[PDB]
Subunit: 79 residues, 3 copies
């Protein structure tokens, strides 16, 4: 039922992974992958405002660092 | 505070003074967000005051810094 | 620039063109803010041009790259 920020962040991440898991072959398609990533960021900020925490905030930024390490860090910058 | 670099140091020290006594709580994400927001507000207030963009490379180094010393070892 | 990825290379190449002649000043924070602000504005402009979110993963990889090659080892205050 989502009643604090930590569990909100889990909610956002879970929705994000549901998008990212089955499209591994396109993680470095920068234009395409910008959509689910936007939905992650925006979810993170939406729930930051809902719980009156600022944005960015440390948990949100750990989450953004985590996707960069697991999805994007070893992508080529030109396809 | 004669310039941006010394304003950034001023911001950074008001932040640490808030953070050092509450090491136990550095991974209480809700709580810790407050002093962190003050640091960002400070970094941005002084950026505009010295007519520099935000984010900017020095402000970003301060953000990496606090992630490295306060939040890196935290369970998510 | 036929797409976002090539837009991001134009931004990045223009940035390096301004940075390379001022290597002795990469740690002059107030000074080096100008070319960096232009880089961010360039990344955001083309982002909005191609109706992608900003920030986005590719743009963030460029940010990380300048932090790694330009600013990682600078003193936080000049002598
Ligand atoms: Ca805009
Ligand atoms: Ca779009």
């Amino acid at each position: 039922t989502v009643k604090n920020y930590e569990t909100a962040v889990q909610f956002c991440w879970n929705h994000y992974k549901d998008q990212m898991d089955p499209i591994e072959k396109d993680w470095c398609d920068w234009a395409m992958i910008s959509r689910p990533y936007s939905t992650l960021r925006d979810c993170l900020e939406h729930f930051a405002e809902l719980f009156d925490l600022g944005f960015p905030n440390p948990l949100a930024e750990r989450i953004i660092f985590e996707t960069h390490q697991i999805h994007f860090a070893n992508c080529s910058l030109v396809q």
